[PDB]
Structure 1
Amino acid sequence: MKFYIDDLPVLFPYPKIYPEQYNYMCDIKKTLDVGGNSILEMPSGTGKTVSLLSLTIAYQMHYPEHRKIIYCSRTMSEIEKALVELENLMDYRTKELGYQEDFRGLGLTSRKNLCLHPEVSKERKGTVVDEKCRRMTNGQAKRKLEEDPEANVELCEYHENLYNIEVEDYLPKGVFSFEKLLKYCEEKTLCPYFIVRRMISLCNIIIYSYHYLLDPKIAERVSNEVSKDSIVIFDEAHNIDNVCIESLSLDLTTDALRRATRGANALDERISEVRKVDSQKLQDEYEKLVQGLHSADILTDQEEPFVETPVLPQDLLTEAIPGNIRRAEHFVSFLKRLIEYLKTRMKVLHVISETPKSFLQHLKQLTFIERKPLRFCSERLSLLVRTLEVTEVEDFTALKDIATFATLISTYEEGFLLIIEPYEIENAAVPNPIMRFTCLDASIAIKPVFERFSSVIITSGTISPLDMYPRMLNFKTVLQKSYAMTLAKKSFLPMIITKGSDQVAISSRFEIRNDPSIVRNYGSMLVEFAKITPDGMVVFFPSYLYMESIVSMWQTMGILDEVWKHKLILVETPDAQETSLALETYRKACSNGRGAILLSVARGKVSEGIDFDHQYGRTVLMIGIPFQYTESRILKARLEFMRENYRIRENDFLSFDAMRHAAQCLGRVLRGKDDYGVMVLADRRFSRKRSQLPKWIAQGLSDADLNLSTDMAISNTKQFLRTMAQPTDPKDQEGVSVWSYEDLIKHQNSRK
């Protein structure tokens, strides 16, 4: 349809529209026109991505400002869905306006997802892929080939073919999903990664993950190309604090330092070798360092620093190199004795938590390393590596960890803590000391974003409570609200199971995981639901270890044998590719009527973007509240930090963290309003968390379902599934849950 808001014409790609979608679009436009941030929570059974793209694209195409759009999702798989929705929306616009308007929309991701080189795309880790591409694209190979054609260094035909054509002609006008982008680039032998990265400044809408906006290592290059007045959308940002914290965190092991000394020794040997034969390089670098230049002025735009900048760009010192680490050998000695100090700090016998200031003071005492040189460690190493012609950098890889640690601990002092533990795994014959640099404040990484951009929309399906995100992340919103779906007939049955058919309490507390009664009670619930679930059944566990133990217990008990008769058993595994194959099989078995059951972790890879709608999900079995491991030094430090700063009680945050994951998994079962499923929360502690669930889920949870038994939940499920299989009466939803164009106009008349 094509309807009107106060003055903005918006073309919806569907003939019908939900009341929630229209209200969602109206609120978004109000936020955009008034300026500022907002937090909008729309249910999962209502199209959110299409509504966002429909309004925002229309907004950019109508107003004189022509503000760009930045779309942030949490995983790469979501970028594809957003791009597919964008393609569908733009195709509708091209057919209704009579022409293809000037529009470019591209997704962004790593080389590993976009490498077409037959020999470099066959790697099992992205770091190696980046290294090989850099070797063929840094320009060292091209310059050597220019001087002497006989050089055996190779290139990438994809990267080289781009230089023939201009940046504005890399792709035709339109929207390019990754599936479409790779196909187009393969037929013309071009690099999708370099095409995308060189077209961000030209895109009307750019879609990437949160790691490309919050992580300083990969963000600064991308951030410098996007505009300052663009529309910023945070899609599915209910777990954004976790991304913000891992961006400024690091871990050091004994193996890391043992591998760092070898690299430092190799670096010293390389410097000596270069000193004998070709010494002009060292002097040339030293001269520029004395002048006051940094990596930006020395490195060409074609090459990248060896050590990614680990701190936010606003905290990097703009002064010249301190002079202590100005020469190659002096920096190596500086680096070596820093490694030695780290090694001697790994021999503690009890957990030590210290501020970055205390660590710096002790470092300045035992050795004589000051704060300022430590801040330039990463910046200097990238220069030394660049000037040493280090064609293979396998030896020096470990030094990137030491440099990253050095530049972090010397930069930030508030909101950061250094934990040293003699036991990474308490269940080990021999201690394995670990050193963790943890970020406690989640707003440090997101502070630049909320200041650089004027308007930001924070939207998600299960982002509740809405007051805690402004508290946790220091930002203020013009409006924060959650919509309740106007579903004519109840489509999802949320239930809470507190005990088994024997009326014995059930819980997923880790200390009683190996309990014959709780294990058998959960297994009986799994089997009984597997008997009435028609097609698909997803089961989420609080942790992977809990799932591993209980599944093994079920095998001995024989509970799995009963499940095998009705459905196939697919299990989430640590390997990502194997889990992807499990998802493919699970979907296939759901489609052909064989029936499948998928056991996954609530805080795992499956729960962070994979949706189980229609037949892929008809029942969700939340086995326990997904609490973290409370006896974690990092979490306890974060809980203490939040309590003192933001006045958040430790239990409140722990419950909030657990519920934001339980609700996260619940909302992945409804796509439209014709979708239905049963949500069962199997834990006695869930009974008092109804007020903590999202508003649209809490409204559907009845007072009788707050504490059910397994038999009483099965009987209700059987009745509900039977009821949802009947032909819905169109008149019951003709104008109360689904709107035609005429109905929408009426709603615009009565309101005004």
Structure 2
Amino acid sequence: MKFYIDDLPVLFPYPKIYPEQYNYMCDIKKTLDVGGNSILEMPSGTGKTVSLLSLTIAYQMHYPEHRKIIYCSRTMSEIEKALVELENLMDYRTKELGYQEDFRGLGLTSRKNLCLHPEVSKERKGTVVDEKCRRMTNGQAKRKLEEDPEANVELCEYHENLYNIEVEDYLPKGVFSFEKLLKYCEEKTLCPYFIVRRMISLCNIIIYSYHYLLDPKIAERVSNEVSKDSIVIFDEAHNIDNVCIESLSLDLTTDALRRATRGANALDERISEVRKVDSQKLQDEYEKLVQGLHSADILTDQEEPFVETPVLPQDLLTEAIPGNIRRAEHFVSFLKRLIEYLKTRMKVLHVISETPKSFLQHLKQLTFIERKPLRFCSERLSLLVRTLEVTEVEDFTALKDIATFATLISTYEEGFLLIIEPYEIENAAVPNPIMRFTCLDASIAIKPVFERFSSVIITSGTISPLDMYPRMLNFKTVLQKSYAMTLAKKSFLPMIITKGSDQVAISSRFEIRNDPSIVRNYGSMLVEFAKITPDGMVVFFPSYLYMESIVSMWQTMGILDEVWKHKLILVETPDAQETSLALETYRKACSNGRGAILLSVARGKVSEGIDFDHQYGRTVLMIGIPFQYTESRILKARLEFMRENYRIRENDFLSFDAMRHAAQCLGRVLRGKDDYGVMVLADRRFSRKRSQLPKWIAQGLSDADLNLSTDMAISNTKQFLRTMAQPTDPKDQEGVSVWSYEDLIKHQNSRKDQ
């Protein structure tokens, strides 16, 4: 199609359209006209990605100003989803237009999933791979190699071929999805990571995960060339706040503290030996401190920066010397005092939580070490290590942990809160004190971007209610609109199976435990569904331990034998690799004959990015409703902050979060409108939350479908599956809900110009 938005050619890649998509285009354009934020809940039953990209590409390529687009999907999985879809859009746009492209748009993830060097990438832990690539191609090992040709220094050489040809120019012209990028850069033997990383200065539109936007420890290279004005799109933004918090929290365990002790000892050895060999350079660095923050080589570092800056991006940093810390031995002694104070405060008997200011004063009491010198510890340690040009980091992992802790707790205040839990009550009365440190205000991490960028978007197939986010994140919006699934047919059957056959209220709320009534009830539910649905089914237990116990003692009964007799079982397990393997076998079985069941965790990785299309998902479940307070009081503290700072009570917030995750789980089971699928729930408490759900889910959830028993549930879903199976394709009722090629939109809404 090529219709108009009263100024904008739109090269929508499909002959068909959807109505909701057209409204989406209209409203997002209206947003881009006037600087605002205007969160927009478009049900995932449609294609939100196609609408977003089509309109935004057309806008950027039509007006002359907003030259760059930033797209932040939650996980690299959705990164490549957006990438492949964008590539197809681009091909369509060229095909309809000839060649008017001149367009580049690149994904951006990390070394671990990009480093092509065989031996390097053979490593598993991402941090190690990062370190290996750093050493193999640093500003220093290159000098060691070139000045001293020797077997000591090797290189990916992909960095070298880049240095030869790629950093004069760019990749040919494509919007390279990771499949395409990896294939090509394998052929031409390049290092994809550095390729895209340097390329950022030229890509018309960039796609990268949230962390690269909010995690200050990697959101450093944000080069306002990237936007300065750009139009920014948050896809799948319902889990924003937790990304901020997890980007700003921090953990401590006495064992890591002892590791830091070992690292400090190794540091003493290293400084001793080097100052025996060379100290004049160390004094030169003393002078480079005394002149200023040493930005000339604490910041002008093509390859150097060792310890990231966990504080917000340099906003809350001074630039003078850290006074006495200028001496390296002084610094080591400072860290010694710090770690010992941490140990003794760690031996505290029971739970204790403090404001950072309070803890700061207490440390001052025990050892008068001031805040201002403390803040500089991170870069101090990092550049000291650079001056030490150490051969390994594993010894210093705990050191950088402590540096991060010091910087955070010395920098921010009155938004964060310490807490010292001496143990894990799930195995209480054991030695395992943890110095948990976390933020409370989600808005802190976001605030810089809403400060920087002007026109931003928020979009998800699940966001609800559309007012909690302006509250929590403390940001101004314009258009807070929700879109309704205009369907000429039912197409999915939300239910609330509150009572099993025993007509007994059920949930996971009681405990994390057994109560054979509940267990047998759920097992009956699951097995009858496994009998009835065709290939493809999911479940979403509320928490991992819950699944572990439940399935263990299901296997105790014979319940699993029956579902074995019908379909396949594919559990969800903590190691990511095996999880991916299981998931792909699930897909392979669904599209094959045998039906297959995958049971996972709502909070877990599976729900985050994985998609469940027509075949791959028919009948999700929600065994229980996901809640967190199973574990300790960090949620309690954050909720305290919530109540005092925002006019929000506990159960309100808890229910809101729970329904957020529930909707995120549920929305996965549809892709288009041709798709369909049951979406059951299961708990007594669900019945009253019917309004918390996103609108388009609520519409399909009629009143009569509440607190149904399992039996009537099976009846209804049987009738559904049969009815949907029918080829109910009048194709004239689809002129209502499809707005066919170039005309029904044109006719209908060009008349609706009223």
Q: With structure 1 as the length reference, what TM-score do the two structures score?
A: 0.98
Shift of 1:394: 2.2
For 2:314, what is the secondary structure of its paired residue?
Answer: helix
Q: Is the 8 A contact 1:691 1:698 kept in 2?
A: yes
Q: Deviations over 1:140-180 (max 9, x none)?
A: 12111222213521111100111111435331112100110
Shift of 1:693: 0.5
Q: Is the 8 A contact 1:536 1:616 kept in 2?
A: yes
Q: Is the 8 A contact 2:2 2:742 kept in 1?
A: no
Q: Deviations over 1:454-478 (max 9, x none)?
A: 0001000000100000101010111
Q: Deviations over 1:116-143 (max 9, x none)?
A: 1111001111100011101011121211
Q: Is the 8 A contact 2:500 2:521 kept in 1?
A: yes
Matches of 1:124 and 1:269, distance apart in 2 = 30
Matches of 2:602 and 2:468, distance apart in 1 = 21
Shift of 1:501: 1.0
Q: Is the 8 A contact 2:298 2:305 kept in 1?
A: no
For 2:448, what is the secondary structure of its paired residue?
Answer: helix
For 1:606, what is the secondary structure of its paired residue?
Answer: helix
Counterpart in the other structure of 2:672: 672
Q: Is the 8 A contact 1:106 1:175 kept in 2?
A: yes
Q: With structure 2 as the length reference, what TM-score do the two structures score?
A: 0.98
Shift of 1:750: 5.3
C-alpha spacing 1:89/1:210, structure 2 compared with 1 (3 Å)? same
Larger mean CA deviation between 219-228 and 173-182 belongs to: 219-228
Q: Deviations over 1:281-330 (max 9, x none)?
A: 21111110011133554454322321110011243323311311001100
C-alpha spacing 1:96/1:657, structure 2 compared with 1 (3 Å)? same
Matches of 2:143 and 2:315, distance apart in 1 = 35
Counterpart in the other structure of 2:649: 649
Q: Is the 8 A contact 2:3 2:746 kept in 1?
A: no
Matches of 1:298 and 1:319, distance apart in 2 = 11
Q: Deviations over 1:425-461 (max 9, x none)?
A: 4424523100011110000000001110000010000
Q: Deviations over 1:355-391 (max 9, x none)?
A: 0001000100101210001100001001100001202
C-alpha spacing 1:535/1:56, structure 2 compared with 1 (3 Å)? same
**Identical residues among aligned pairs (%):** 100
Shift of 1:257: 0.6
Q: Is the 8 A contact 1:510 1:546 kept in 2?
A: no
Q: Deviations over 1:694-741 (max 9, x none)?
A: 000000001111110000000000000000001122334332111123
Shift of 1:220: 1.2
Matches of 2:421 and 2:296, distance apart in 1 = 38
Matches of 2:31 and 2:159, distance apart in 1 = 42
The equivalences for 1:470-485 within 5 A come to: 470-485=470-485
C-alpha spacing 1:296/1:243, structure 2 compared with 1 (3 Å)? farther
For 1:417, what is the secondary structure of its paired residue?
Answer: strand
Larger mean CA deviation between 457-466 and 507-516 belongs to: 507-516
Shift of 1:70: 0.2
Q: Is the 8 A contact 2:310 2:407 kept in 1?
A: yes
Counterpart in the other structure of 1:36: 36
Shift of 1:67: 2.5
For 1:319, what is the secondary structure of its paired residue?
Answer: coil
Matches of 1:460 and 1:582, distance apart in 2 = 27
C-alpha spacing 1:749/1:715, structure 2 compared with 1 (3 Å)? closer
Q: Is the 8 A contact 2:210 2:243 kept in 1?
A: yes
Matches of 1:393 and 1:489, distance apart in 2 = 60
Matches of 2:686 and 2:114, distance apart in 1 = 43
Q: Deviations over 1:88-128 (max 9, x none)?
A: 00000110111151100100011001011111001111100
Q: Which residues of structure 1 form unaligned runs of 5+? A: none
Shift of 1:746: 4.1
Matches of 2:168 and 2:230, distance apart in 1 = 20
Shift of 1:749: 4.6
Q: Deviations over 1:480-507 (max 9, x none)?
A: 1110011101101101100111212211
Shift of 1:336: 0.7
Report the count of equivalent residues: 752
Matches of 2:111 and 2:224, distance apart in 1 = 19
Q: Is the 8 A contact 1:295 1:379 kept in 2?
A: no
For 1:434, what is the secondary structure of its paired residue?
Answer: coil
Larger mean CA deviation between 470-479 and 135-144 belongs to: 135-144
C-alpha spacing 1:750/1:92, structure 2 compared with 1 (3 Å)? closer
Q: Is the 8 A contact 1:735 1:743 kept in 2?
A: no
Q: Deviations over 1:639-668 (max 9, x none)?
A: 110111111111000000000011111100
Q: Deviations over 1:243-275 (max 9, x none)?
A: 010111100001011000110111111001001
For 1:708, what is the secondary structure of its paired residue?
Answer: coil
Matches of 2:348 and 2:751, distance apart in 1 = 69
Larger mean CA deviation between 197-206 and 385-394 belongs to: 385-394
* Runs of 4+ residues over 6 Å off in structure 1: none
C-alpha spacing 1:66/1:454, structure 2 compared with 1 (3 Å)? closer
Q: Is the 8 A contact 1:351 1:422 kept in 2?
A: yes
Q: Deviations over 1:651-692 (max 9, x none)?
A: 000000000011111100111111110011110110111100
C-alpha spacing 1:578/1:268, structure 2 compared with 1 (3 Å)? same
Shift of 1:354: 0.3
RMSD: 1.3
Larger mean CA deviation between 140-149 and 356-365 belongs to: 140-149
Q: Is the 8 A contact 1:213 1:223 kept in 2?
A: no
Q: Is the 8 A contact 2:735 2:744 kept in 1?
A: no
Matches of 2:46 and 2:108, distance apart in 1 = 26
Larger mean CA deviation between 214-223 and 330-339 belongs to: 214-223
Q: Is the 8 A contact 1:137 1:302 kept in 2?
A: no
For 1:687, what is the secondary structure of its paired residue?
Answer: helix
Q: Is the 8 A contact 1:295 1:383 kept in 2?
A: no
More strand by share: 1
Q: Deviations over 1:510-562 (max 9, x none)?
A: 52630000000000000000001101010000000001111111111111011
Matches of 1:351 and 1:719, distance apart in 2 = 55
For 1:316, what is the secondary structure of its paired residue?
Answer: coil
Q: Is the 8 A contact 2:421 2:435 kept in 1?
A: yes
Matches of 1:47 and 1:553, distance apart in 2 = 41
Q: Is the 8 A contact 1:488 1:732 kept in 2?
A: no
Q: Deviations over 1:624-648 (max 9, x none)?
A: 1111125522100011101111111
The equivalences for 1:403-418 within 5 A come to: 403-418=403-418
C-alpha spacing 1:631/1:545, structure 2 compared with 1 (3 Å)? closer
Matches of 1:266 and 1:346, distance apart in 2 = 23
Counterpart in the other structure of 1:456: 456
Matches of 2:296 and 2:52, distance apart in 1 = 37
For 2:165, what is the secondary structure of its paired residue?
Answer: coil
Shift of 1:226: 1.1
Shift of 1:508: 1.0
Shift of 1:397: 1.8
C-alpha spacing 1:16/1:716, structure 2 compared with 1 (3 Å)? same
Matches of 2:397 and 2:314, distance apart in 1 = 26
Shift of 1:423: 1.0
Q: Is the 8 A contact 1:232 1:456 kept in 2?
A: yes
Q: Is the 8 A contact 1:315 1:411 kept in 2?
A: no
For 1:570, what is the secondary structure of its paired residue?
Answer: strand
The equivalences for 1:166-177 within 5 A come to: 166-167=166-167, 169-177=169-177
Q: Is the 8 A contact 2:572 2:579 kept in 1?
A: yes
Q: Which residues of structure 2 form unaligned runs of 5+? A: none
Matches of 1:741 and 1:588, distance apart in 2 = 34
Q: Is the 8 A contact 2:253 2:433 kept in 1?
A: yes
For 2:622, what is the secondary structure of its paired residue?
Answer: strand
Q: Is the 8 A contact 2:495 2:701 kept in 1?
A: yes
Q: Is the 8 A contact 1:378 1:407 kept in 2?
A: yes
C-alpha spacing 1:524/1:371, structure 2 compared with 1 (3 Å)? same
Q: Is the 8 A contact 2:166 2:195 kept in 1?
A: no
Q: Is the 8 A contact 1:514 1:550 kept in 2?
A: yes
Q: Is the 8 A contact 2:423 2:429 kept in 1?
A: no
For 1:699, what is the secondary structure of its paired residue?
Answer: helix
Counterpart in the other structure of 1:302: 302
Counterpart in the other structure of 1:400: 400
